[PDB]
Design a protein around this nucleic acid. Structure first.
Length: 594
DNA sequence: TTTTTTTTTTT
């Protein structure tokens, strides 16, 4: 490896050519599309990219999900180039905790370690918080993640740093002071939400440079969603209505919302039954109430809901009514279906960028859907070839057996698919994950399998999270019993079903021996940005996005080379029929054999 | 040529 990039030594040999290409084109000013599989060590490649850019003198920003942050700090904690230029991190308020409230909670619930941690400065206690504290050269006190270690059942939202907490409380001081972290280091880590929020603040005229010389976006497929959430302001009624109890026109606003299975989807002002009177009356009834005596945590409820009111005030945004999983509560949203001005503002403030993810391309090296999703200027965009190593598909045997009945939410399909699922559960030599597209489909399957499989069965639901079911899936495997997981939603994309009780030895990993696709993941995306992107583009957008979700669902099986005896099952009979529209999903499966 | 997911951790 003559004349290698900094940190290139610990990069997998397979990704060295891609790292070389990405480094050159990013240095050339292009916004680079670099796609590589999960187990190829994209974190090491990113660390080498950032270090090489940093020693050029570049102010470098690495935007990545907070979960990935700990891996990225470690991967470039020790390479000499970043050691000289320094590596810092930018954290928003939701990372921290109110010392007053979290201590006031520990006394109420008699949690000795929790109160004793806050008494004494809320010092970092985890290895991650302590080590990142040394790497940052800042002491990361009052961290939420540390507080969870002492009491997992703490009401996280009740205790988080709001913007309303007093200036004198240590947590807000630490956050506000650390807003200047980009001053004191060459490479800056943050989440996609932080980058989107920074871009929005830049547009409207602090925590990031005004111009980013080089930007690496890890898990870049999620960056689009972060902009949508940041640019969406949602009004929650029951928390507000309950907070004033401790106005009548707002009750009439809810009654009015009821007049207008699609309820007010992607319609800015075409329906105005009484919303603009009810909005304006709510605007004044909430902002005129006395700040004096308003609880330091209740003024936040007022502020966030008037923000949603004044985001629906402009009329420059779409509206949509949603309902909580717990109960049929009223929620009003003001999102944006066109995100070009904001995204373009980000890309202008960037000299060069590398977009890194495992699913960036629709087919081959075509990143046009991602280029349009993120509004990457075509002049600056660049599509490098992907890295799809052979070992990502080798341990997988694809079975011909499938469910003849087509998925139509019927009881008829549910039992037939359940019989095939039971057949998979018997032959399974480990954990089994069956992927469902709907709550209805998985609840139907649960009704047909709850008695048959008994304790083995895990059902994701409105009351059972993917994280909850993931914990039970690991636990049931710990107890030697072979679980089956009726998974939906986040189980499709973003669960690490690789066993960490077997670090050095992947050949003996059998946490997930059977993956079962019950249905092609069509209709899995309903965001305002994508729904508009579908209305203009047609069913191609539907099929391309479904294939992306399909590849991500298949990516749960193999997470590192050297595993063996992995089973892949796709039961959607449409795959095996003639229909031309299922041709892409056929082609993905064509890379397995026998 | 299709269909309903609750991500994340910003102000």
């Amino acid at each position: 490896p003559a004349d290698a990039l900094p940190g290139e030594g610990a990069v997998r040999e397979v990704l060295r050519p891609l790292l070389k290409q990405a480094a050159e084109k990013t240095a050339a000013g292009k916004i680079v599309f670099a796609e590589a599989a999960t187990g190829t060590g994209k974190g090491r490649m990113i660390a080498s990219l950032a270090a090489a850019a940093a020693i050029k003198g570049d102010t470098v920003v690495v935007s990545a999900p907070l979960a990935v942050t700990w891996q990225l700090v470690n991967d470039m904690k020790d390479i000499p180039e970043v050691r000289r230029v320094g590596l810092t991190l930018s954290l928003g308020r939701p990372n921290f905790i109110s010392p007053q409230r979290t201590l006031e909670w520990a006394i109420d619930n008699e949690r000795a370690d929790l109160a004793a941690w806050i008494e004494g400065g809320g010092k970092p206690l985890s290895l991650r918080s302590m080590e990142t504290s040394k790497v940052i050269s800042h002491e990361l006190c009052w961290l939420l993640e540390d507080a969870l270690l002492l009491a997992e059942d703490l009401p996280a939202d009740s205790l988080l740093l709001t913007s309303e907490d007093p200036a004198d409380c240590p947590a807000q001081q630490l956050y506000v002071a650390m807003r200047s972290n980009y001053t004191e280091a060459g490479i800056i880590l943050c989440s996609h939400f932080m980058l989107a929020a920074h871009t929005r603040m830049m547009q409207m005229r602090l925590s990031l440079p005004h111009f980013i010389d080089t930007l690496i976006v890890d898990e870049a497929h999620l960056l689009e969603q972060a902009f949508a959430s940041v640019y969406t302001h949602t009004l929650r009624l029951r928390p507000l209505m309950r907070t004033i109890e401790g106005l009548d026109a707002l009750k009439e606003l809810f009654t009015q919302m009821q007049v207008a299975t699609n309820t007010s989807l992607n319609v800015p002002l075409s329906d105005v039954p009484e919303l603009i009177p009810a909005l304006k009356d709510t605007v004044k009834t909430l902002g005129a109430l006395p700040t004096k005596g308003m609880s330091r945590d209740a003024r936040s409820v007022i502020r966030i809901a008037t923000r949603a009111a004044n985001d629906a005030l402009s009329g420059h945004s779409r509206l949509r009514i949603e309902v909580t999983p717990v109960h049929s509560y009223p929620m009003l949203l003001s999102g944006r279906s066109n995100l070009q001005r904001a995204l373009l503002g980000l890309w202008n403030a960037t000299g060069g960028a590398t977009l890194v993810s495992a699913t960036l391309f629709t087919t081959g090296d075509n990143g046009s859907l991602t280029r349009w999703k993120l509004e990457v200027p075509t002049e600056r965009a660049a599509f490098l070839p992907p890295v799809h190593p052979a070992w990502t598909t080798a341990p997988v045997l694809l079975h011909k057996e499938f469910c003849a009945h087509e998925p139509d939410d019927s009881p008829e399909w549910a039992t037939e698919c359940a019989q095939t699922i039971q057949g998979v559960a018997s032959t399974a030599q480990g954990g089994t994950l069956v992927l469902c597209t709907s709550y209805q489909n998985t609840e139907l399957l649960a009704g047909r399998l709850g008695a048959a499989l008994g304790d083995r069965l895990i059902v994701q639901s409105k009351t059972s999270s993917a994280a909850t079911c993931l914990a039970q899936f690991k636990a049931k495997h710990k107890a030697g019993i072979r679980p089956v997981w009726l998974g939906l939603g986040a189980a499709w994309t973003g669960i690490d079903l690789s066993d960490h009780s077997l670090p050095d030895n992947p050949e003996l990993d059998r946490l997930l021996s059977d993956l079962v696709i019950t249905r092609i993941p069509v209709g899995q995306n309903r965001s305002l940005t994508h729904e508009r992107r579908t209305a203009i583009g047609g069913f191609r957008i539907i099929s391309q996005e479904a294939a992306w979700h399909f590849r991500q669902g298949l990516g749960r099986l193999v997470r590192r080379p050297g595993v063996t005896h992995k089973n892949l099952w796709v039961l959607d009979a449409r795959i095996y029929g003639g229909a031309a529209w299922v041709a892409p999903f056929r082609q993905i499966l064509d890379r397995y054999k026998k």
